[PDB]
């Protein structure tokens, strides 16, 4: 103003994972079309922000990072995310280094994980060739092995962008209502 309560952002930040790995064109373009849609569908109610720092590292020797992303920079980015959610705008992270929900499981971010799922590995393969194949297939396969109810908040398995967008919007409109009762008053 053992602990029973963990402090989390006032609006759970939306993080997209799948169909495959970020940094490659199939995943990057498929997620971008979704971010583009959110930007206009939730205009005035959403903040979409790039996170390049490796927020997977968020949680008597001093703890340090062995990559270019420091624990101080990560902490700065965690505080920026909490602060962006403080007035209850929807928050969406374009988080470069998160390709799997287990990478945020131990943070205090409590994300809404949106799984952009290609149901068939054969469809994913052909997609990639239509444009480093094996790292992409393994990442998609890892996603497909997660227990869906506990790992993901939304699964977009629709093959039409229009239908994936409306399903995600429906979810985010309901979250909006849950967080804004009338009684309270790639990118």
């Amino acid at each position: 103003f053992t602990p029973p309560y963990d402090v989390v952002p006032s609006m759970r930040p939306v993080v997209l994972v799948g169909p495959s790995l970020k940094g490659y064109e199939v995943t990057d373009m498929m997620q971008k079309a979704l971010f583009d849609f959110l930007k206009h569908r939730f205009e005035g109610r959403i903040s979409i922000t790039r996170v390049t720092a490796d927020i997977s590292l968020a949680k008597a020797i001093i703890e340090r990072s062995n990559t270019r992303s420091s624990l101080a920079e990560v902490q700065s980015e965690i505080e920026r995310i909490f602060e962006l959610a403080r007035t209850l705008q929807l928050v969406v992270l374009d988080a470069d280094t998160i390709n799997h929900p287990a990478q945020l499981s131990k943070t205090s971010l409590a994300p809404i994980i949106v799984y952009v799922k290609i149901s068939s590995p054969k469809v994913l393969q052909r997609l990639i060739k239509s444009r480093h194949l094996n790292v992409q297939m393994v990442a998609a396969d890892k996603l497909a092995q997660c227990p869906p109810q506990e790992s993901f908040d939304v699964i977009l398995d629709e093959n039409q962008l229009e239908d994936a967008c409306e399903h995600l919007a429906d979810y985010l409109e309901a979250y909006w209502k849950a967080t804004h009762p009338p009684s309270s008053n790639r990118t």
Partner: peptide, 16 residues
């Protein structure tokens, strides 16, 4: 054929 409609869907998504 379901896989073929899948692929066309995702190709159109990527194009968008």
């Amino acid at each position: 054929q379901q896989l073929e409609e899948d692929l066309k869907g995702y190709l159109d998504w990527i194009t968008q």
